[PDB]
Amino acid sequence: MGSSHHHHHHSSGFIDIAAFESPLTSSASIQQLLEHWAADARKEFEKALMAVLEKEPGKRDIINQFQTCPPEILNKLVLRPSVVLWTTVMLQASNGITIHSIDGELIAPDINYLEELAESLKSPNEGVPYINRDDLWLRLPFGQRILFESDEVGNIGTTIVHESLKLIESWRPALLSEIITISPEIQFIKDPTAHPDKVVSFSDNSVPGALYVSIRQGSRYIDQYDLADSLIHEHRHQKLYLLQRSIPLIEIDAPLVPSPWREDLRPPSGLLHAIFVFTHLLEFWAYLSREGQDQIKVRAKNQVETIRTRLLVAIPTLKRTHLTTAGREMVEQLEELTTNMG
Amino acid sequence: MGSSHHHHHHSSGFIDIAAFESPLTSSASIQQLLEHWAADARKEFEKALMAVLEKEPGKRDIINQFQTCPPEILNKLVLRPSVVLWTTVMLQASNGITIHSIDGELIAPDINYLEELAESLKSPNEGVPYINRDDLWLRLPFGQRILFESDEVGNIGTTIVHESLKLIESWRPALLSEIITISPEIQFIKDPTAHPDKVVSFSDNSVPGALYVSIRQGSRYIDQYDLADSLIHEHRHQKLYLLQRSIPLIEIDAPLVPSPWREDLRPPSGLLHAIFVFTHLLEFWAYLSREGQDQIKVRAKNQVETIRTRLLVAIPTLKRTHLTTAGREMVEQLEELTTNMG
């Protein structure tokens, strides 16, 4: 009924991947991928700064703040989710290309964002992962379809996030460090169309580095384990976005493959993102089923059985797809982790 | 809630197209595109025949009938929707790549299809557009999600199809000839999940040349005008599949753009397919509002207003996308037809 049948793909005729997977051995690989991405993003940001000066030459004094800015600060600034979206929308607007939010609304290029962006350089040291910061260029890709929690709602959510991050740190301190480097922004969302008891968490690569997690289950708040699951789930997408940017994993994103997590046929890259996400959540709930409290051991044992079953069905499905050399190396490493935990 | 946010396209940084659009002036352009496609498909079909001989060398006598078959027959055979799907599934199976139907079921490569296919050469070729032919390799991309009408249901549908094709011939005899060349197969379907009053019609490029139209709708049957709309709608997809095959129309199928026909963001190629489909449907209902019967003039005037309104909103949206030189030439020709309607 829904369908995706017009695919133009009816033409079917340099880093350690294994070390990148585990947070213990990924530190160097991530730094290497971030340096390559920041090299392209600095040029893109400079191109956007020149486009701002063409429309409004009066913005020259605002642009001057970045000119003398140290490259160490500038390299971290151009990779922020809100900055990447602003730079992308800005460059596409100059090429006559429109960018829209999920609700079909046009994301207008705002020159006045540079003034807010320049004033951020006057206080560089802030919280390691930015918990529910008020930034329109983080809310823009969703428009009105997704609501952003604020005030008392955000105040309570910050404390639950702190306990989820402390829980993640107790399991793997290397994964918390990985979260600070790849996913530095945590936004609190609420899906009005979703069922109150459903935990909603999503990620978009138009804003890379921002994790959108729901803290409210109706009027009630979710717990530190479910919120840590949501944070790890979206962090794994952000981590794979970084790898895909430089080292492609899928040679041909067709034909569509079935996923144990979706009813419809999803592309091979989507199933790779799903296995990459759920491999880390299988390891998280495996730790909670052994070294966790007696109250969590019931839910954790259910999650291990549910996730391992789905992973053991998705991995063979993905193996018979157009995977690159790096993509196949990733699948074989994720399969090894699922097998060594049965 | 639904979402499609992991697009690996976060890297945003000759044929007479006008003559191809109208069926009156497309005859030569279509023949050129079909000759190029048949040249590649004949090699792909030969590769599949050699793969059949590797698995079962006993099928040597059946493969010899195809190899010694006249090129005029063989060129038309390799481009049939059921043959294209068989060849694709067969070649992908040899490369360790699985193909699935919309319901997630694996489409198994059937060597025994060649025997049924060889008996089609020996049999006298019936009616130019094959109305509801019993062929599993036409039903395979849908599996169990879509039901195929047969017996008394198909018997009635054949008569309604004949009146729809006669209605299309009375409007533009060039469009009926175009239908016989590009879309030679009409299958009768029923979507159990769809609302009875909804007219369901779809097409897939894994089976190019097959139009899937619904004839039974609730406790009634579709009329010749609604069925002609369904046939023209799916034929326009099949015609654009042929063009896209050789001459690409979208340079970058990102960012996602809003469509007046769908609730959420669809790719630029999807919106191009929609405008290409609805431009011809606008011309069809414009003819029915002027030269049609008094009973159809009410429905036709409503369709012209509904379709022109949506086309006038989709065309500017698509113009601000990564269109190739040919893609932009197509959009400007479709915009001219929409504008020249008052």
Any chain B CB within 8 A of the CB of A44?
A: yes
CA distance B295 to chain A (A): 31
Other residues' Cβ atoms within 10 Å of the Cβ of residue A122? 7
Are residues B257 and A100, on separate chains, in Cβ contact within 8 Å? yes
Are residues B102 and A257, on separate chains, in Cβ contact within 8 Å? no
Report whether the peptide linkage leading into residue B70 is cis, meaning its omega lies within 30 degrees of zero: no
Q: How far apart are CA B318 and CA B341, in angstroms?
A: 20
Q: Tell me phi and psi for residue A220, to 5 degrees.
A: -75, 160
Are residues B10 and A205, on separate chains, in Cβ contact within 8 Å? yes
> For B320, which of A47, A98, A241 is closest by C-beta distance?
A98
Any chain A CB within 8 A of the CB of B50?
A: no
Chain B partners of A320 at a C-beta cutoff of 8 Å? 96-98
Q: How far apart are CA B293 and CA B301, in angstroms?
A: 12
- 240-279 of B, contacting A, C-beta below 8 A: 241, 244-245, 248, 250, 253, 255-258, 264-265, 269-270, 273
> For A10, which of B205, B265, B270 is closest by C-beta distance?
B205
Mutate to test the interface with B, among A4, A12, A319 (most CBs of B within 10 A): A12
Are residues A321 and B40, on separate chains, in Cβ contact within 8 Å? no
Q: Which of B317, B234, B326 is nearest to B280 (CA)?
A: B234
Chain A partners of B97 at a C-beta cutoff of 8 Å? 12, 255, 320-322
* DSSP state for residue A199 in the 8-state scheme: P
Technique of determination: X-ray
Any chain A CB within 8 A of the CB of B332?
A: no
Q: How far apart are CA B56 and CA B110, in angstroms?
A: 12
* Residue where the block lists tokens 């709602």: A153
Give alpha helix (H) positions in chain B: 17-21, 27-55, 60-67, 71-77, 81-94, 113-122, 136-139, 152-171, 173-182, 224-246, 268-291, 297-319, 325-339
Are residues A244 and B8, on separate chains, in Cβ contact within 8 Å? yes
Largest CA distance in chain B: 65
* DSSP state for residue A308 in the 8-state scheme: H
- Rounded to 5°, angle at Cα A155 from A150 and A156: 115
Q: Using DSSP bridges, classify how beta strands A265-266 and A257-258 pair: parallel, antiparallel or unpaired.
A: antiparallel
Any chain A CB within 8 A of the CB of B8?
A: yes
Pair of tokens at residue A59: 């913005």
* Residue where the block lists tokens 């956007």: A48
> For A258, which of B100, B244, B253 is closest by C-beta distance?
B100
Resolution (A): 2.8
> Which are the contacts of B298, defined by CB distance < 8 A and separation ≥ 6?
none
> For A104, which of B13, B145, B258 is closest by C-beta distance?
B258
Q: How far apart are CA B58 and CA B61, in angstroms?
A: 7
Largest CA distance in chain A: 64
One DSSP character per residue, A83-143 reads HHHHHHHHHHHHTT---B-TTS-B----TTHHHHHHHGGGS----SSEES---HHHHTTTT
Pair of tokens at residue A86: 């602003």
Report whether the peptide linkage leading into residue B258 is cis, meaning its omega lies within 30 degrees of zero: no
> Which are the contacts of A40, defined by CB distance < 8 A and separation ≥ 6?
B13
> For B100, which of A91, A240, A255 is closest by C-beta distance?
A255
Whether the Cβ atoms of residue A125 and residue A167 lie closer than 8 Å to each other: no
Whether the Cβ atoms of residue A181 and residue A38 lie closer than 8 Å to each other: no
- Residue B316's identity, in one-letter code, is P
Mutate to test the interface with A, among B4, B5, B234 (most CBs of A within 10 A): B5
Are residues B100 and A13, on separate chains, in Cβ contact within 8 Å? no
- 170-199 of B, contacting A, C-beta below 8 A: 191, 193-194
- The sign of the dihedral angle between the CA atoms of B222, B225, B231, B232 is negative
> For B1, which of A10, A96, A193 is closest by C-beta distance?
A193
Pair of tokens at residue B97: 């790549």
Tell the burial category of B82 from Cβ atoms under 10 Å away from its Cβ (0-12, 13-18, 19+).
Answer: buried
> For B320, which of A13, A96, A258 is closest by C-beta distance?
A96
- Residue B264's identity, in one-letter code, is D
Whether the Cβ atoms of residue A282 and residue A40 lie closer than 8 Å to each other: no
Q: Whats the size of chain B, residue-wise?
A: 342
Chain B partners of A10 at a C-beta cutoff of 8 Å? 205-206, 208, 241, 245
